Ligand binder design. Structure first.
Ligand SMILES: [Mn+2]
Ligand SMILES: [Mn+2]
Ligand SMILES: [Mn+2]
Lengths: 586, 586, 586
């Protein structure tokens, strides 16, 4: 049952003509705002956002409380309060501390909603319930129905981030296994998930994965459909293994089968499968109500059974053998923390999220030193090498194209069947190397097209301080083939690659590309299509996660009004305010 | 809408006949629970309590999730989880912080439900979401359908209290005027109502009340119905005023009219009146969505107009000219902290609450000196005089008799109109003394019957500590008329009276009657009928208000299990645990 | 390298003869202490305790600085300062915050040790580093070298506990699996182990155990030995499974084989096995450096592979197919918190530890109702069924016997091989009930001999409060054969049983037997032989873990001096002391 947005039309309660004068414009402003969001935006799942409107305009507590009754029955997880006139501050505001809120005041003189806004905001900050401000840059006339650029931008950025918050609430992270090679992020912090995101964590031991394959706790016909799809579509790459370690044709397909079964069995665990009920396996059918998940893999799975690379790549992809669909969020090396970043990215943009190891920083001096060539253009100042250990969403090739014909990544509802297969055609599946993946496996190798805007994000936990976010907006570069193959042969050529250059501000961590990587707080990161830092920043305020690091333009910063009271400085305000309000849910 | 109780039947997840073998009993047990609550309990307003059972038994996150969706659209604000078997702990618990919750495990051996209870509870306190334990004293045979008596007490005590938490949530306290005569409780701490109770505060200047009377903003037909009704029933008391400050009948009619108007205009303010819409006054029709109020009175109102003595009495009573109805909660002198006690007591009992000033402690030495005869029986160790400034719930006369035919106060739905008139028959209406109340008034004078159990409660705000709760289970007593008459003349004989004897423990404040007076945290207190200390204590723990003074036996103290982990000592664990979890809402 | 005990003799600084008088006495008293300790105490593993003395006698900063670097060199985890004279306080105290320290002032008149003790403690508590205080009631003459009874208890109790804290520092807890059946204790909290105990947690997925048994990563020679032993010594009980679920003998051989192979494999993982390195399995030969360990089992392993009933039971015993050894600590269901109470139990007593489900409380009324008979003697007031879900240290049969020939448990170095076979011939190996344990297994069933004194303990984590300790001293009982069989039948007759009865104080949780269970913090607990509540209380205090529940007479309560400054109440002092000082390690 999807969350909804609740519009609260708010009004001057005084009569003898004043209320009746204002009613129509007020409710129409409400309607306007439903209209704007519902057409402009979608859930990440794909569905149409349903906005709920109060039965009458609110001018005080009786009317205000009817709305709450109407909203609770209707699962509203966000609200916007809209008005063109002055109304009675604290009597009319929304006091539920759990939901993100925003106040839109019509910037006018004849209709001075802007005035009420600043007062209703001051009530919010005084009662410890922060709210966002929507304030038009230019005074409009009282007979105008248009919505300016700025207002619409905020209205939408707000709603984009509010629907993310409410979508996580009440849902599960599924931890298939636990700690992978002492990686911090795989030490799943149930209190972080419960207190900040409002999630439950379900832990499942990887023998549960094994059990499902063996005891035939999957859809047997789907396996054949999957394999059929696998055969027609999968272009294989070079085996790189030592000769005595190679696998014959029959062994190679048993690996492949298992790999596919793992993908299937994980999905069955995350979201359930009615077919297993029919098949009689009634217990296993319900799933763990999980919108994100991790798979440990190394060391203990991959030292005997096939690595999860295929399964991870297919589940993070927008498409598979059953057609196009909304991508899953499955973290490799069970990196619950990178999964959070993915899950936010997913819910903010509706697109596939590229899991990525932050492998190498290529210094301009260093690249001249081994390729003989110069880093040129976007890579002038240095390059960074994003390359996961055998898995990534296939959407990352960027064979998807926009309307202007440039390479990009897109929502699942915007994706035609031809673009699905085009992305497969960019993908060669190289066997895993047996010293590390003794059970075998297949990598998904691709190269992300150059010149794509990307947002590198990461969430870390810092003892004594809590969770923090890191952001680095940038671009993928496309190096000369001569240079590329030699840095690729240099690293791990079996694996998917992305060349990333980050926007520099010449300040602090973004002074030079070196320090960007040097101030990263983990070996992993998530790549989200686009420049979305401004949207990420707003979500981190809503969760009261401060941002230790970002290159987003100061003008673009959008947070609850309460934050500005915590200081003029954009960074300093964030730590005090986050400390103040603390986690949302407990 | 009214709040509902969610019942969560929880079950072992495994099949092969295991879940099957239990579904029946586990479902039957939720139904038995909802039935009992629904039969033996009512809302404070007299409505039937609905209960919502989960669609399926719960064994994991997915079923648990669907219970939540069901519960959210159904306005449930209390849960009880029931099981007769072991289940999967943290997967199956209710996670919402803002709801009171309980767990009831079947004390069986074939059915080891208490073994899940113990694990679930440990889960709760590890995850900072405390919950109540319901464990039956005696092992029960698997086929037994009956609910033990000790289990019934706990279930009901929990429901009774939980409903009160959920009833206050989102309602208003209407403060009519500001501070009265420097009384701390008249400084309305808006944050306390928000954070602790989940209510809001509406402030109305008393000029508004004047305005309604001036501009005839009230159902005019009602007024002559009121006035008619009083003329038929109101006894009158001697004018203890001076000769020059006495009033001719014409003047007296003016105050009584006004005294009865205030009752109606305050009531109309608190909840609203559709008649006012019908007469064109659509703004005033609505009300402030208020379940409690307070009226300032002195000095600024009582120095010109008639005091609220009469209004307050009738409003807090369980009947008026329109017959027997659920009482209101209006605080004399705008004592919002006496308001809260009144509110809490009323929600726990359904009955009317007696506002009292805590006027005199009469020593046994002191009584013998002024009357020549000693206090005897229940008054053996001292008496405390409880007498409010002119007002009190007429039901406080205790003219009502119960099933065994002895003095009491019943929930309004067990009040026959015949009894209603007996409480009016024992009340004499006496004029206000002019020097204090210049605008005059009438004061409901009655004498409470002896031997009636009472609990006396107060809430107080201690800066740097928060809200605290005082409780004192005791008896009202009858004194010999000669004795009573002397002590009434010294104090105020136009004012209603109750002679209170607190039950002693011989320890702390309850070592003697003097100490009970001397520790009481304010000049005002509240009388709830019967011995309801246990219910208050439970309610207090649900709201995380520590209890600082009580004479309830140690076995009766019922609180979440987490409390026990903060220490064996019932006073020590309470402060520490209350310090830990803090106010419920923010 | 085990920790050592550092003994500090301290002396009056001043020379000119007086110092020189005391030097002989001062260190003769320190050598007595080192002799007393190493005579009456041994390490839990069996080794003799090594007491390092300071090279000189300490009288100022200079000598005390030498003594530390010597003490750092020798691995002392505990210090005991002794003296028979005045010395210079702030100059002579051990200042290392991590080591648990005690000070032993001699009670003489010519030799004023008492005075030094108070000034030293005062300096300690003023400098934030609590220490214990040893003081004899009765005064002794300076020529007397014998050490009195009461000083002996305080020295032994201190060193016994300080060694516990010392032995756990830097060691690891091995988590074989993740969360078991949503049990809080099996959500291993890494930061608890680290901060409070100075331990690490190593997480291994249960698939790694699979690999070791499938790829023969074990000693195959021992395996045959084990099977041989198993055939010779194992008695079997009857199969209580359904017929269609009964295993034939070919299957029962494999199930047994793997159960035993689990034992061996889990051991290897904990401490290393060098036979493996010879065998070319060098990486698996090191192990994880573990002094406790949890095994998850349900649900994921037990739904396809044989359970750990047998393995757990054999590892936690004081003997196996290689004869008598220091028992291991393996927690069933990966309940790490029960593991911690086992670890503590073990370190303090050197015995085996019994892991229990706190399954049923049998009120007198209940036992009369069902058996027709009444409980009697120690069982007079109630009885609590302690029964683990398949596995328990076989020592728990209490077939081992003491000097007088009374039932008991002994540390592994006082257990005759004849005794171990006694313990084993009390057992019968019942096959696992198929529907809970699909994979099979063998549940070690015995009946604990009555009259034995026992201590039940538990550790819980409370959000906002941190860890806490539960203690209940009592005895096991022996009921009439007829009564036992009625009670056992309906419960779980294939599983090991212990009838426990807690000493009642009349107060709080120990007012009666119902309360004991009712306030118990989890489904699980640990049985440690005898009445060692006094020991756990002392170890808790060194560990800064409040004691929320205990029935130890307060005469025996022994904690650091600083505690006394936090109040007279033996409970309030504790919570305040623990919140002040908090975890030893970060
Ligand atoms: Mn990696
Ligand atoms: Mn008063
Ligand atoms: Mn158990």
């Amino acid at each position: 049952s999807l969350p909804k947005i609740g519009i609260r039309p708010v009004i001057d309660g005084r009569r003898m003509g004043v209320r009746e004068s204002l009613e129509a414009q007020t409710m129409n402003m409400a309607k306007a705002t439903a209209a704007l969001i519902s057409e402009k935006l979608r859930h990440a799942c794909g569905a149409q956002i349903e906005c709920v409107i109060a039965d009458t305009c609110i001018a005080g507590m009786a009317e205000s409380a009817a709305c709450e009754e109407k909203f609770s029955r209707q699962n509203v997880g966000v609200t916007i309060t809209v008005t063109p006139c002055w109304c009675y501050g604290s009597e009319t505001i929304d006091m539920d501390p759990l939901r993100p809120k925003a106040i839109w005041g019509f910037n006018g003189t004849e209709r001075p909603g802007a005035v009420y806004l600043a007062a209703a905001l001051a009530a919010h900050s005084q009662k410890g319930i922060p709210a966002f401000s929507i304030y038009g840059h230019d005074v409009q006339d009282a007979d105008d129905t248009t919505i300016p650029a700025d207002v619409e931008e905020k209205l939408l950025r707000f709603a984009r981030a509010g629907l993310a918050v409410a979508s996580m609430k009440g849902k599960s992270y599924l931890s298939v296994g636990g700690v992978s090679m002492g990686i911090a992020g795989s030490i799943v912090d149930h209190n972080f998930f419960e207190s900040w995101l409002g999630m439950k964590v379900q832990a499942v031991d990887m023998t549960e994965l094994r059990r499902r394959i063996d005891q035939k706790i999957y859809d047997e016909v789907e396996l054949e459909m999957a394999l059929a799809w696998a055969d027609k579509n999968f272009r294989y790459g070079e085996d790189q293994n030592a000769q005595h370690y190679k696998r014959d044709e029959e062994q190679s397909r048993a690996v492949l089968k298992e790999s596919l079964l793992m993908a299937m069995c994980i999905r069955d665990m995350m979201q359930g499968n009615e077919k297993l009920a029919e098949k009689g396996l009634v217990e296993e059918s319900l799933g763990y109500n999980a919108i994100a998940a991790g798979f440990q893999g190394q060391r203990h799975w991959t030292d005997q059974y096939p690595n999860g690379d295929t399964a991870e790549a297919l589940l993070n992809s927008s498409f598979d053998w059953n057609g196009v669909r909304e991508p899953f969020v499955v973290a490799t090396e069970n990196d619950s923390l990178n999964g959070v970043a993915m899950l936010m990215g997913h819910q903010l943009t509706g697109t596939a999220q590229v899991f990525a190891d932050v492998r190498t920083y290529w210094s301009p001096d260093a690249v001249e030193r081994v390729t003989g060539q110069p880093l040129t253009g976007l890579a002038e100042h240095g390059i960074i090498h994003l390359i996961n250990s055998g898995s990534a969403a296939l959407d990352g090739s960027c064979q998807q194209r926009d309307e202007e014909g440039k390479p990009t990544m897109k929502p699942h509802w915007e994706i035609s069947q031809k673009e699905a297969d085009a992305c497969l055609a960019a993908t060669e599946w190289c066997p895993a190397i047996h010293e590390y993946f003794r059970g075998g496996g297949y990598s998904s190798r691709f190269l992300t097209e150059g010149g794509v805007p990307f947002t590198m994000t990461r969430v870390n936990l810092i003892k004594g301080l809590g969770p923090v976010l890191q952001i680095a907006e940038g671009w993928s570069v496309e190096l000369p083939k001569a240079m590329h193959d030699q840095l690729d042969a240099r690293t791990n050529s079996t694996w998917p690659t992305t060349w990333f250059a980050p926007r520099l501000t010449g300040k602090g961590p973004f002074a030079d590309v070196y320090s960007v990587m040097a101030n990263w707080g983990a070996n992993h990161g998530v790549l989200t299509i686009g420049h979305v830092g401004a949207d990420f920043i707003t979500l981190a305020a809503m969760l009261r996660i401060p941002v230790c690091m970002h290159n987003v333009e100061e003008g673009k910063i959008y947070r609850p009004s309460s934050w500005a009271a915590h200081g003029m400085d954009t960074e300093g305000q964030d730590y005090r305010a986050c400390q103040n309000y603390g986690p949302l849910y407990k």
